[PDB]
Write a protein that binds this ligand. Structure first.
Ligand SMILES: *C(=O)C(CNCCN)CNCCN
Length: 8
């Protein structure tokens, strides 16, 4: 998930 550039 890139939800806040978190790109997990
Ligand atoms: C979120 O985008 C992640 C994939 N990592 C980013 C680059 N491939 C997939 N979903 C989160 C992990 N379960």
């Amino acid at each position: 998930x890139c939800y806040x550039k978190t790109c997990t």
